[PDB]
Symmetry: C2
Subunit: 204 residues, 2 copies
Amino acid sequence: MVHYKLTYFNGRGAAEIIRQVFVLAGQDYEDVRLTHEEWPKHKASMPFGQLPVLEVDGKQLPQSVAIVRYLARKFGYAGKSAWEEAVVDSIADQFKDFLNEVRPYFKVLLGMDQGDLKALEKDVFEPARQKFFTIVTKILKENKTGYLVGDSLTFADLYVAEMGFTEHYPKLYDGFPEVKAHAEKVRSNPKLKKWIETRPASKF
Amino acid sequence: MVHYKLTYFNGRGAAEIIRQVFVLAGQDYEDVRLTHEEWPKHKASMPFGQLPVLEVDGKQLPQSVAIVRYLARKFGYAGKSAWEEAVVDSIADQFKDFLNEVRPYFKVLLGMDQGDLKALEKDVFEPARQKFFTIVTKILKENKTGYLVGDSLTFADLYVAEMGFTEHYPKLYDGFPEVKAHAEKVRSNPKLKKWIETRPASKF
């Protein structure tokens, strides 16, 4: 009845979680994937000249987390009480800072930078992986449902469990089997399982 | 009533806007400001070993923006419909981006004085100041009340507005007078106006 259109580049990136809420919700949307080469024809048509962008019966919503929170609330995956929704927010925010403090080492194998790789692993990435994964393992333990917050999936689950696709690092949750099992349990969800089985492979 | 406690370092930084949602609502709360020297005494007590943390009658919420949203939601400064709420999210998202992008320029020296001194001002800063202030300028014009989204103040307004400030750089809002009026129109509000004159003096 309601038409949603998601516009992003072809691949996972900043639009994957948004895809995931649509998937969890049983919700039928148009996933428009644009080439880097096509992108300048639609660029000026976006809010901040940026992707991803959501349209809801023709109204534009920019910015990845905005859109994730927006869809999650309307569908029931943002948290079960208002306090829980902020908790959910605070964990998505914290994971995101883990993402940022970890980019410069994400590329020194992937696409760009020219550094001692072993001493970025060890002076950036690992004391960063220690921090967050010990945080996550603590939250799991206290909440005791297998899930991060309450006992149904939230988008905070979606964000951390999806970083399992960086198996460019096989030893990612080595000293952290509780983290590893969270992301098995999230992706063991049936709607998502079949999504990750039938979604386009990408490098990004 | 409800006991609110905000903990942060002695400054505006990540916490200032949490502190303004409070002033706005005329709710008071204990403004705990730690020195960097005291901080190792408090760090294990916090959710992520990070500040700000809000306590709401004993229970801790971490992550400055999670906290900002929790408060504005409760006190009515988050946006005036679900749609609007999300809009407010996106614009403060876009503003956080404007900062991350900008940070490592602002009088440089992200470490020892000797940090390179001015490829930066035009390579990075102005392309963004231009991008973002032109973004805000257009949003203001489309909206047509003097505020970013809908009719009343939101944390969005509060985010952008606080920018007037670093002023260890005098130029801002030169080519952008509707962005200047917005900033003045935000701290035109009397609770806020009086918070500006009254809050502690700090470097950050």
